[PDB]
Design a protein around this ligand. Structure first.
Ligand code: NGY
Ligand code: NGS
Ligand code: CA
Length: 819
């Protein structure tokens, strides 16, 4: 049973002919046409039951906001004496962003019903008719827009933005908490100050909040090592309780409980998602920030939620690593796996401080010599950039700073020094490692092997030589010392942030050829190296193609799975079932960022053809591992850098797929829904535009949206009458001509027109090729649009008193703002 829901709708329109009658609400009054509806005395009787639109060039639109989710079967429009010769019907969840549901619609006569049927009824809070052309110069005329269906009186979900989707989240009673400039925060413990710092780092700029630590503040964080959310853990669910938090908020208070300092940062990240996708605004906004009234209880499914970054192929400066850490933290990733060494580079300084007794190795050569090499474009015959990998390395100071910044965002460092293959940078850097069964050998009269194409994929450390293990042990000791110093600088607890794991690699030894004995080499090397990790009170990690040494690595070692089917891999099952091992899941087709994210893009094709947000989301790491939940540590994305030369190009591949892995890492298997995640991507993107982070504008994402935010003009420079009053963020804009801006000013008493200048520094571009090779930074997002107005002299010269109105319209967006 359907009804005309027009009669319960809140009705808006592009405009109206006259202020006094023919209002848009007269399309929504469920009245049959009067007798003789085309007669002018009937169509133009002052009380005629019809909308008469604004004039001008259009488009002209009529929008219904339902008090609930409407399930709409059909729209039947009774057109008046001026009818739409071309129109569409669009839907909106938010009332501002519109999506086509029926296009190519036409009326063909006066006083004509045009019925548009949805064979599958559509569920929507908003619907509108938008018309581009009409039958006469007169105002478009609508007697009736009947929207036939049923309605469910469900309120908007103030928690709909959250990613990852929490364990438990429900709206609470009453108004939102309004954040004020001097709103203070109380913590139970100093280790929670980093969580408040994360909030202040965004909100200080975007909303001018001090968020000072105070006493008896209305926002509190409490560390409770016994926090229990198991009430919300169902028999088919599984959590890591150490990262549990709760939030309980109302109009007067925001109360956070955290099981760990790390969980306090997760709580802060949740609060920043609730405040909305403008918290990283580089400019003070005019709107106040609100935390809606909520009850949240949250913890992750998996304890290990990571990103591998490979600076070894192409270096990433410290400031770029910080921008990665910011977004990793924003999605509750807790692990930064650094692939520090490769055939093509070594990216951290190792000193001669604290060497073992008898060790006179000169470690300073390693960064000096092997920092200076990188992936060679000339050794590629493909679409890889013409530019070689970036060279360089983090100094110990910068590496300690990297550790501290990661820790202050809830992220631990997991170092990898790959061997015995993928190790040419070590041989190239340290004369002393060129001994025993190492490969390749230095040319006659040389103390280190030449960085030439024939070395690549043919490297082996000397698995038979004591110096190999001396060197590895020193590098482990140096990394540990730097990690300890960075955690100390962060103030986060070492018990939380010092990840007692070391990644030995073990992958693809002699992939391109080399000296043979592949298996006997893995077994000797990973046996002795594993013993180094164990004696340092750590758990060994190896890639799955190093489990040739499953029996020689320590009991309880971890496999990082990337290649083939883990569930059928005998050596993985042996580790997990016979050697109390655990698994980190990085199957290439679900987690490898170089795998091209769309069929329109240029990139690696082998794992999926294109591994999209669907491939990154729609998998279950435990069933992919073919093991039990208890044996799965979690997941890591991989950013391999053979082809990456910039943070912009890395972020193209990382985002938004990384936010799918974040949900796989955190969200319960039975709470995952790819369509629900997909709907959340639009605001994920508005926040990335505010951060200045790049992202692939994937075709399978269907929530790309615009968002208008008013700017606090009091903090903006006026130049020759021109001042920034608004920003408009929409991924994919190639220019501003699709957008119509209008602004008016009213001093109390007075509305005058302000001419608007929209200004977008950069346009959207997909990847660019030159001579068959990707151009570095070819794919880049458009800028947020700056919305300037030019003030008249009387307004320019007035003191501080008035109301600014700004309206933005496109075929897919409409918003009117006032302050
Ligand atoms: C205020 C008022 O009466 N305005 C009406 C309009 O709404 C109408 O669209 C127009 C043409 O009417 S038609 O019947 O010839 O198309 O005539 C009058 O201008
Ligand atoms: C463990 C591991 O992945 N080892 C190697 C990495 O040295 C390589 O860099 C990466 C490329 O990823 S791809 O570009 O997505 O194929 O894949 C594997 O070849
Ligand atoms: Ca009517």
């Amino acid at each position: 049973t359907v009804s005309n829901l027009a009669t319960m709708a809140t009705v808006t329109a592009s405009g109206r002919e006259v202020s006094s009658g023919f209002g848009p609400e007269l399309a929504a009054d469920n009245q049959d046409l009067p007798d003789n509806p085309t007669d002018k005395s009937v169509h133009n009787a002052s009380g005629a039951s019809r909308w008469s639109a604004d004039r001008g060039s259009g488009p002209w639109w009529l929008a219904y906001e339902f008090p609930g989710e409407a399930t709409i079967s059909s729209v039947n429009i009774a057109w008046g004496n001026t009818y739409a010769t071309n129109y569409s019907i669009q839907t909106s969840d938010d009332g501002s962003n519109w999506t086509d549901v029926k296009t190519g619609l036409k009326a063909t006569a006066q006083a004509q019903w045009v019925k548009t049927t949805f064979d599958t009824p559509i569920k929507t809070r908003h619907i509108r008719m938008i018309a581009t052309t009409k039958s006469q110069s007169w105002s478009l005329s609508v007697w009736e827009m009947r929207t036939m269906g049923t309605i469910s009186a469900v309120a908007t979900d103030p928690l709909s933005r959250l990613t990852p989707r929490p364990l438990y989240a429900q709206s609470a009673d009453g108004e939102a908490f309004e954040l004020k400039k001097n709103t203070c925060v109380s913590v139970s413990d100093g280790s929670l100050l980093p969580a408040v710092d994360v909030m202040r780092d965004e909100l200080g700029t975007s909303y001018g909040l001090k968020l000072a630590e105070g006493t008896n503040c209305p926002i509190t964080f409490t560390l409770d090592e016994n926090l229990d959310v198991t009430g919300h853990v169902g028999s088919a669910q599984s959590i890591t309780a150490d990262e549990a938090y709760t939030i309980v908020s109302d109009a007067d208070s925001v109360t956070v409980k955290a099981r760990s300092a790390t969980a306090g940062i997760w709580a802060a990240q949740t609060l920043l998602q609730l405040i909305g996708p403008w918290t990283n605004s580089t400019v003070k906004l005019a709107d106040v920030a609100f935390i809606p009234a909520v009850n949240i209880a949250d913890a992750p499914r998996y304890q290990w939620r990571g990103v591998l970054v490979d600076p070894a192929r192409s270096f990433y400066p410290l400031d770029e690593m910080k921008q990665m850490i910011d977004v990793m933290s924003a999605y509750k990733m807790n692990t930064l796996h650094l692939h520090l060494s490769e055939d093509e580079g070594f990216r951290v300084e190792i000193t001669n401080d604290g060497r073992a007794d008898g060790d006179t190795t000169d470690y300073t050569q390693l960064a000096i010599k092997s920092g200076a090499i990188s992936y060679q474009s000339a050794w590629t015959s493909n679409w890889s950039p013409a530019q070689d990998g970036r060279t360089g390395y983090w100094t110990q100071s910068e590496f300690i700073e990297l550790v501290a910044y990661a820790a202050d965002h809830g992220i631990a460092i997991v170092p990898e020094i790959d061997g015995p293959g993928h190790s040419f940078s070590l041989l190239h850097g340290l004369a002393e490692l060129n001994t025993g069964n190492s490969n390749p050998k230095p040319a006659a009269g040389e103390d280190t092997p030449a960085f030439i194409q024939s070395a690549q994929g043919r490297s082996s450390l000397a698995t038979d030589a004591d110096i190999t293990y001396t060197v590895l042990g020193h590098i482990m000791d140096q990394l540990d010392g730097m990690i300890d110093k960075g955690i100390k600088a962060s103030t986060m607890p070492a018990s939380e942030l010092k990840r007692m794991y070391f990644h030995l690699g073990g992958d693809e030894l002699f992939l391109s050829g080399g000296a043979g004995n592949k298996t006997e080499r893995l077994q000797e090397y990973l046996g002795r190296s594993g013993a180094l990790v164990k004696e340092r009170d750590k758990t060994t990690i190896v890639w799955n193609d190093g489990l040739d040494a499953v029996d020689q690595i320590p009991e309880g070692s971890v496999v990082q799975h990337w290649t083939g089917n883990a569930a059928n891999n005998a050596s993985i099952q042996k580790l997990l079932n016979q050697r109390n091992g655990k698994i980190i899941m990085s199957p290439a087709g679900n987690t490898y960022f170089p795998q091209r994210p769309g069929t329109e893009t240029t990139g690696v094709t082998w794992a999926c053809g294109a591994c999209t947000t669907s491939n990154f989301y729609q998998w279950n790491p435990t069933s992919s591992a073919g093991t039990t939940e208890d044996k799965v540590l979690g997941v890591e994305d991989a950013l391999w850098s053979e082809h990456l030369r910039s943070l912009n190009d890395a972020e193209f591949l990382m985002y938004t797929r990384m936010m799918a892995t974040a949900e796989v890492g955190w969200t319960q298997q039975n709470r995952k829904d790819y369509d629900n995640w997909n709907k959340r991507v639009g605001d994920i993107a508005i926040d990335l535009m505010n951060r200045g982070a790049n992202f692939h504008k994937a075709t399978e994402v269907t929530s790309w949206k615009g968002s208008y935010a008013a700017v606090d003009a009091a903090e903006q420079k006026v130049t020759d009458g021109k001042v920034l009053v608004g920003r408009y963020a929409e991924p994919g804009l190639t220019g501003t001509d699709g957008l119509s801006f209008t602004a008016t000013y009213t001093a109390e008493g007075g509305a005058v027109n302000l001419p608007v200048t929209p200004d977008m520094k950069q346009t959207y571009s997909q990847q660019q090729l030159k001579n068959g090779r990707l151009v570095v930074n070819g794919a880049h997002m458009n800028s947020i649009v700056d919305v300037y107005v030019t003030l008249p002299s009387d307004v320019l010269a007035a003191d501080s008193v008035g109301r600014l109105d700004v309206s933005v319209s496109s075929s897919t967006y409409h918003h009117h703002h006032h302050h």
